[PDB]
Amino acid sequence: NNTLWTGPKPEANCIIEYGKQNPDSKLTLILVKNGGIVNGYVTLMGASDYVNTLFKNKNVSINVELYFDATGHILPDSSSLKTDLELKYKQTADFSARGFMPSTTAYPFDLPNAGTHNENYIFGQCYYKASDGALFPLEVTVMLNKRLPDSRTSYVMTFLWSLNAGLAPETTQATLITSPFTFSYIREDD
Amino acid sequence: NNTLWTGPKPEANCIIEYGKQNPDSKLTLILVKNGGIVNGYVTLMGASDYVNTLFKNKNVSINVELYFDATGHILPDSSSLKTDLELKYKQTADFSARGFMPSTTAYPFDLPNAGTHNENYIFGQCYYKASDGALFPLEVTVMLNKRLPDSRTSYVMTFLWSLNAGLAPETTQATLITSPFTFSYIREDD
Amino acid sequence: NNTLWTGPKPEANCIIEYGKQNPDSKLTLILVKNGGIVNGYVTLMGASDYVNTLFKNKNVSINVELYFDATGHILPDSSSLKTDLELKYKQTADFSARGFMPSTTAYPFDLPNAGTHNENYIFGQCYYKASDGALFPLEVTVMLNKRLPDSRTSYVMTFLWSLNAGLAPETTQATLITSPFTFSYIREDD
To answer: Where are the strands (E) in C23-151, listed by range?
Structure first.
């Protein structure tokens, strides 16, 4: 069973809006083991009036933080994603997902008396297609481990999508859709 | 057997020129299953005087449409690709390739009384290296499902490569080569 | 055993500086078989004062050449990488790594009486994050096979990272880190 995911077309499961308590967006996240690497796939779909009016501004930053415990399960209290990932094929009760996690050898934490780790970032691009058909590039940053939010967390995966355009993509509400972004990282031992 | 492909160095198998009836280009397309995703690889090589003079213009659009039946086989009549894909390792007569297809749950069709689906696009870049060595970016769009061409088709995968440059890459015929483009998508159940 | 690599966090194993005889950089290279393709992952970390002051200039080119024998082992004499890759899981003495190599059918050599092969390049981008936080794009070229350095070599994989910026990213020494670059290619038979 080499796929850990949200499902292929999830209902609202993720919070983008600052201070909001209920899901307002649909995060599709898929992690597949392939030898010593995880191949990831991620897209975001908006599901509130707030998220679906972000692109009325020419500057947009969308942040999704995922925090995991020692067995690779989402900590929903602190994470943007409010439902744990699941194995495409069921396993025994609390089966470990540690082998899907980003390696703490390859991507360490910035602990107080260690030097800082800039090797923990993956950067790339995906896109937003506006109502009128025009395509806008979104700069993507994935941060692996590096910064613990609290003393309850073992692994970190964060996503930032950024738009700093000349003019707003939209002048009316429209479904926010990030085109799928693929990435690969060195995984923990099973 | 987890690879469905054209072979690694195919002879001319694809039609680019509008209205032409015989292959004028070599499409390399490779689809590998990896858990719940397909990892794809695609490149195009020109094989006619028409295709190999496209880049004498500063604006170029190259379209390849693939249409598949319910068991994941090419419909050659309507498709740009005129020979079905094959399994790297032979299977039994008309073995199904449905598990290589793009998911109709993740990437639905725009049917008459459904809203339209902009989540069905993957965008990226690959490149053309000109005769003089200069490198040109090609904008790539992959469309999955979304628009049926006719009532005989079950799955769709289309490719668009676009150049809108300041000056033409070429002033003489040269072999059109798109550098390889990789992409991943959520697949149908086997 | 489908992973051939440097290990996930190698010590200095690679030479960047022209004419230097000892390692001055840490190359992370990971090759995973996935059906008929290899999925690759590559990053470079500097480990000398020379490598870690390259980005004080606005124009930077970093070249890494890997040359392999008929069984897919590094030839260290000619290669930038001075230690052979290894299987994540041990095999029998001199187990062949030929199945990780780039296909000579898909990516041929430019031999004297053959036409030249521009289909042997993969191009893309990764990034350098400077001391002050500013992000710089690095143009990446991977060359597969194509040009033999000598008559002792069977396969070639070369990497070029290029920066031609408006202003230097750095004004003091800093650890050179290329953000991870992923690529896929058609592999040789096992």
So the answer is: 25-34, 37-46, 59-68, 86-87, 121-129, 135-144
Task: Please name the residue of chain C whose CA is at the shortest distance from the CA of residue A188.
Answer: C8
CA angle (A61 as vertex; A56, A67 as ends), nearest 5: 140
Calpha distance B27→B76 (Å, rounded): 14
Provide the 3-class DSSP secondary structure of residue C119: helix
C164 touches chain B (CB under 8 A): no
What does the H/E/C string look like for B96-117? CCHHHCECCCCCCECCCCCCCC
A161 lies within 8 A of chain C by CB: no
- Tokens 């479904």 locate to A175
A184:C179 CB<8 A: no
Distance CA(C88)–CA(C91), nearest Å, equals: 9
> CB within 8 A of C22, min separation 6: which ones?
C15
The CATH number linked to B117 is 2.60.90.10
Distances (CA, A) of C118 to B128, B170, C125: 9, 15, 19
What's the domain count of chain B?
1
> How many A-C residue pairs are in contact by the CB < 8 A criterion?
54
Greatest alpha-carbon span in chain B: 52
- Residue ranges making up the domain that contains B62: 1-190
Question: In A35-166, which ranges are E strands?
Answer: 37-46, 59-68, 86-87, 121-129, 135-144, 155-164
Cβ atoms < 10 Å from Cβ of C135: 14
Q: Where are the beta strands (DSSP E) in chain B?
A: 3-5, 25-34, 37-46, 59-68, 86-87, 121-129, 135-144, 155-164, 181-186
Chains B and C: how many Cβ contacts under 8 Å?
54
Longest dimension (CA), chain C: 52
- φ and ψ of B55, to 5 deg: -80, 10
Backbone phi and psi for residue A100, each to the nearest 5 degrees, phi listed first? -90, -5
Best residue in C3, C32, C101, C119 for a mutation probing chain B (most B CBs within 10 Å): C119
For chain B, which chains pass the contact test of at least 3 CB pairs under 8 Å? Answer: A, C
Q: Give the experimental resolution in Å.
A: 1.5
**Integer Cα distance of A65 and A80 in angstroms:** 5
Experimental method: X-ray
How many Å apart are CA A157 and CA A78, to the nearest integer?
Answer: 12
For residue A128, what are the CA distances in angstroms to A65, B73, C64, C188? 21, 31, 35, 38
Single-letter code of the amino acid located at B169: P
| Cα-Cα end-to-end distance for chain B | 12
SS3 content of chain C, % helix, strand, coil (to 5): 5, 40, 55
Q: Nearest by CB to A177, from B103, B106, B118: name it.
A: B118
Closest-CA residue of A relative to B36 is A3
Q: How far apart are CA B44 and CA B38, in angstroms?
A: 20
